[PDB]
């Protein structure tokens, strides 16, 4: 209890960032106070709240959070944070309507005493921000922003940094964003993670790592990138003898290390653990919920490979139901909620929960992974909510960086997933040792430039069929979408797409390979698109339903417009 206080409850000061701001922008209040509490992260010890009301009567009850300011520096090869000033409490709000808001601050400590701040008025003007990310009501396969524009996640996992900490995100994120990336995922556990909130304790949260997460979220705000926050990872509940980067012996949850749990099975039902987990959710909502750059709350990385002594499907399901309900109830902005599994088909008992707004796949597979992605995407349409392939790679023991230094595997997967009907790109691993040093960002730029002007929410896209190849010299396969107005094709050579030794193609090729006949009504306009250079190659008007296939080395994209 290093942050305890033993004084009569009183507000000592309030600082307000600005009295005028734009729609969906951050409005921050600093609160200096004294009171009686053992743990500023526990609302039963001290509960700070901001009560906001727009001019239409809508009310928002925003929990406040304990905060320490830091100044970062780089000490040779590691980030070091110097504390600045005493810690204090903050409220972070974001207005969804324009016009006037009134708000006040309310504080209650463990004595039951309650104090209040006077009503303040702020004014909100229109801004460029599109709002929070939601499931599309027009097409449940896809995400939208509040303003109705689509959100197609294009990016990769970027889940933790080296010892350089936030300085790595300074490098990775601008490169991602300038190459069409608008998405990444970060880990808030286990305790070794860059943004670990439960670093030494499950009762009190790490103010340095929370500040690093502030920094990276602010950088995403500047770059128009949107983040999935993964709260916990399976390692926390996996025993040393079970392998796969286990961490139970080191995790703060374990009684040996000060926590409430005698064994990982008890995580799901232990009353003390559930209480502190809800305090963590409240802290996360308080500190980060305002941000439209939070794409989603993700409870678990691969919860199915916690210790087999700890995975009880009925209890994990109930815990996800209860925590999703709680999180929704306290999150004024109702961010999307999800969870993930190592087993690529997932766990239907959990994926079917209505409180999980979208489902995910993790898949590491070396052989015929294009077909495996297609099959999984087709299968999970049964949930009638969006599907994110949140992790993807070879099953090569982490050797992708030297088996495939050109990123052909990533290339194949991001084209396959977005043109099979998934909500966005397959999300690669290996951001730090592969994507960045091998400079693989250009793959994403080529894909983003192909899809960005299509409104997927209105095309009524269906996976391509009723097609007939007529190709004699090669084995060419197709992944395709057929919509109201567009047909999008990704063609690949089955005998070249899975070999990674040759250099990046630079076709000069103008040559005729074969044809693909589609059941569509002509006339049409056909655009041939280089998937490595990210450029239109050729354009052709047609009066029949048979599209010539021009020469290409590994794969080729075609955009067809029904006229
Ligand atoms: O290297 C940093 C952390 O790696 C962690 O293991 C990772 C591992 O690097 C790899 O990405 C693997 O497939 O997923 C693991 C996490 O589940 C931990 O070993 C951690 O201790 C390291 O700091
Ligand atoms: O920032 C990502 C990486 O960039 C490299 O050039 C080095 O500086 C690494 O130390 C760093 O982790």
Which ligand is nearest the CA of 428, by number? Answer: 1
- Tell me if 245 CB under 6 Å of ligand 1: yes
List, as one string, the DSSP characters of 223-285.
HT-EEEEEEEEGGGG--GGG-SS--GGG-TTBGGGTSSBSSGGGGGT-HHHHHHHHHHHHHHH
Distance in angstroms (rounded) separating the CA atoms of residues 254 and 273: 10
Report the atom number in ligand 1 closest to the C-alpha of 429.
Answer: 11
Report the atom number in ligand 1 closest to the C-alpha of 398.
Answer: 13
List, as one string, the DSSP characters of 138-168.
S-TTSEEETTS-EE---EEE-----TTTHHH
Nearest-CA residue for atom 16 of ligand 1: 245
Superfamily in which the 133-451 domain is placed by CATH: Glycosidases (3.20.20.80)
List the chain domain ranges. Answer: 5-125, 133-451, 462-562
- The alpha carbon dihedral of 394, 395, 399, 403 has a sign of negative
- The alpha carbon dihedral of 409, 304, 263, 275 has a sign of positive
Top-tier CATH class for 5-125: mainly beta
CATH of domain 462-562: 2.60.40.1180
Nearest-CA residue for atom 23 of ligand 1: 192
Question: Residue 277: how many CA atoms within 13 Å on its side-chain side?
Answer: 24
Question: Residue 354: how many CA atoms within 13 Å on its side-chain side?
Answer: 1
Strand order, beta sheet including 467-470: 467-470, 512-518, 546-550
Closest alpha carbon to 257 in 248, 269, 265: 248
**Pocket perturbation via mutation, ligand 2, pick of 164, 166, 167, 440 by most ligand atoms within 8 A of CB:** 164
**Residues with Cβ within 8 Å of residue 388, at least 6 apart in sequence:** 153, 338, 358, 359, 360, 361, 422, 423, 424, 427
- Tell me if 162 CB under 6 Å of ligand 1: no
State the virtual CA torsion across 446, 447, 450, 454 in degrees, nearest 10: -150
**Residues with Cβ within 8 Å of residue 174, at least 6 apart in sequence:** 223
Distance in angstroms (rounded) separating the CA atoms of residues 289 and 94: 9
- The alpha carbon dihedral of 27, 30, 35, 40 has a sign of positive
Q: Is 300 helix (H, G, I), strand (E, B) or coil?
A: strand
Radius of gyration, alpha carbons of the chain: 25
Distance in angstroms (rounded) separating the CA atoms of residues 226 and 291: 9
Cβ(37)–Cβ(142) under 8 Å? no
Ligand 2 centroid, distance to 433 Cα (angstroms): 10
Q: List 90's β-bridge partners, or say none.
A: 30, 65
Burial of residue 509 (CB within 10 Å: 0-12, 13-18, 19+) is middle
Strand order, beta sheet including 294-301: 155-157, 183-187, 226-233, 294-301, 336-338
Distance in angstroms (rounded) separating the CA atoms of residues 361 and 18: 42
Distance in angstroms (rounded) separating the CA atoms of residues 97 and 119: 19
Cβ(202)–Cβ(276) under 8 Å? yes
For the beta carbon of residue 449, count every other beta carbon within 10 angstroms. Answer: 15
* Residue 519, phi then psi, degrees to nearest 5: -80, 85
Question: Residue 49: how many CA atoms within 13 Å on its side-chain side?
Answer: 18
Ligand 2 centroid, distance to 498 Cα (angstroms): 30
- Tell me if 379 CB under 6 Å of ligand 1: no
* Residue 474, phi then psi, degrees to nearest 5: -135, 165
Ligand 1 centroid, distance to 280 Cα (angstroms): 23
Reported in sequence order, the residue ranges of 17-119 that DSSP labels E, i.e. its strands, are 20-22, 27-37, 46-54, 59-63, 65-75, 78-93, 99-109, 114-116
For 250-260, letters b (16+ CB in 10 Å) and e give: ebbbbeebebb
Ligand 2 centroid, distance to 499 Cα (angstroms): 29
Cβ(525)–Cβ(563) under 8 Å? yes
Q: Do domains 5-125 and 462-562 have the same CATH topology?
A: yes
Report the atom number in ligand 2 closest to the C-alpha of 170.
Answer: 1
Ligand 2 centroid, distance to 205 Cα (angstroms): 28
Nearest-CA residue for atom 11 of ligand 2: 168
* Residue 173, phi then psi, degrees to nearest 5: -70, -45
Distance in angstroms (rounded) separating the CA atoms of residues 75 and 81: 10
Determination technique used:
X-ray
- Tell me if 171 CB under 6 Å of ligand 2: yes
H/E element holding 221? Answer: helix 207-223
- Tell me if 235 CB under 6 Å of ligand 1: yes
Report the atom number in ligand 1 closest to the C-alpha of 301.
Answer: 17
Ligand 1 centroid, distance to 245 Cα (angstroms): 7
**Pocket perturbation via mutation, ligand 2, pick of 165, 168, 436, 438 by most ligand atoms within 8 A of CB:** 168
Ligand 1 centroid, distance to 439 Cα (angstroms): 22
| Distances from the Cα of 389 to the Cα of 292, 381, 393, 416, 430, angstroms | 22, 13, 11, 11, 15
Distance in angstroms (rounded) separating the CA atoms of residues 114 and 124: 29
Nearest-CA residue for atom 10 of ligand 1: 398
H/E element holding 512? Answer: strand 512-518
DSSP-assigned letter for residue 521? P
**Residues with Cβ within 8 Å of residue 354, at least 6 apart in sequence:** none
Distance in angstroms (rounded) separating the CA atoms of residues 248 and 444: 37
Ligand 1 centroid, distance to 33 Cα (angstroms): 40
- Tell me if 74 CB under 6 Å of ligand 2: no
List, as one string, the DSSP characters of 179-192.
TT--EEEEE--STT
For the beta carbon of residue 342, count every other beta carbon within 10 angstroms. Answer: 16
Cβ(430)–Cβ(398) under 8 Å? yes
Cβ(430)–Cβ(400) under 8 Å? yes
**Residues with Cβ within 8 Å of residue 391, at least 6 apart in sequence:** 157, 340, 361, 362, 363, 364, 427, 429
Which ligand is nearest the CA of 232, by number? Answer: 1
């Amino acid at each position: 209890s290093r942050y305890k206080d033993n004084r009569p409850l009183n507000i000592l000061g309030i600082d307000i960032s600005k009295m005028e701001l734009g729609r969906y922008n951050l409005f921050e209040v600093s609160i200096f106070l004294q009171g009686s509490y053992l743990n500023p992260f526990d609302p039963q010890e001290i509960d700070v709240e901001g009560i906001f009301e727009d001019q239409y009567g809508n009310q928002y009850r925003v929990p406040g959070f304990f905060y320490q300011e830091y100044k970062r520096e780089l000490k040779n090869d590691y980030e070091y944070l110097v504390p600045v000033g005493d810690p204090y409490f903050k409220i972070r709000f974001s207005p969804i309507n324009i016009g006037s808001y009134k708000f006040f601050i309310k504080v209650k400590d463990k004595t039951g005493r309650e104090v209040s701040s006077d009503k303040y008025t702020i004014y909100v003007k229109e801004s460029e921000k599109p709002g929070y990310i939601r499931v599309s009501e027009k097409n449940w396969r896809y995400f939208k922003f509040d303003n109705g524009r689509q959100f197609l996640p294009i990016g990769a996992n970027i889940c933790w940094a080296t010892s350089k900490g936030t300085y790595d995100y300074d490098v990775w994120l601008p490169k991602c964003a300038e190459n069409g990336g608008n998405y990444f995922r970060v880990w808030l556990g286990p305790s070794w993670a860059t943004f670990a909130l439960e670093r030494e304790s499950v009762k009190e949260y790490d103010l340095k790592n929370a500040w690093k997460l502030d920094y990276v979220l602010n950088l995403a705000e500047k770059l128009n990138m949107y983040i999935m926050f993964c709260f916990d990872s399976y390692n926390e509940l996996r025993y040393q003898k079970e392998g796969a980067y286990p961490y139970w012996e080191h995790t703060p949850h374990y009684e040996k290390n000060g926590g409430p749990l005698k064994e990982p099975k008890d995580f799901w039902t232990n009353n003390e653990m559930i209480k502190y987990y809800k305090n963590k959710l409240r802290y996360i909502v308080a500190r980060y919920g305002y941000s439209t750059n939070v794409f989603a709350w993700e409870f678990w990385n691969e919860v199915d490979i916690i210790s087999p002594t700890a995975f009880v499907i009925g209890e994990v399901k109930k815990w996800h139901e209860d925590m999703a309900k709680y999180l929704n109830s306290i999150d004024p902005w109702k961010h999307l909620i999800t969870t993930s599994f190592a087993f690529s088909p997932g766990k239907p008992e959990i994926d079917s929960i209505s409180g999980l707004n979208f489902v995910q796949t993790h898949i590491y597979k070396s052989n015929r992974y294009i077909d495996a992605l297609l099959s999984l995407i087709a299968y999970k349409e049964k949930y009638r909510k969006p599907h994110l392939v949140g992790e993807f790679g070879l099953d090569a023991g982490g050797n992708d960086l030297w088996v495939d230094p050109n990123g052909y595997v990533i290339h194949n997967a991001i084209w396959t997933t977005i043109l099979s009907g998934a909500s966005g790109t397959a999300m690669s691993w290996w951001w730090d040792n592969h994507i960045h040093p091998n400079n693989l960002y250009f793959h994403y730029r080529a894909l983003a430039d192909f899809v960005k002007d299509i409104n997927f929410l209105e095309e009524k896209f269906e996976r391509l069929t009723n097609y007939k190849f007529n190709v004699y010299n090669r084995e060419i396969k197709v992944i395709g979408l057929q919509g109201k107005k567009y047909i999008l094709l990704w063609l690949y050579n089955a005998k070249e797409a899975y070999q990674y030794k040759k250099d990046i193609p630079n076709m000069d090729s103008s040559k005729f390979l074969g044809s693909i006949e589609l059941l569509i009504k002509p006339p049409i306009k056909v655009i041939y698109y280089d998937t490595y250079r990210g450029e239109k190659i050729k354009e052709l008007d047609l009066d029949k339903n048979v599209i010539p296939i021009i020469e290409f080395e590994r794969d080729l994209a075609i955009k067809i417009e029904l006229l």
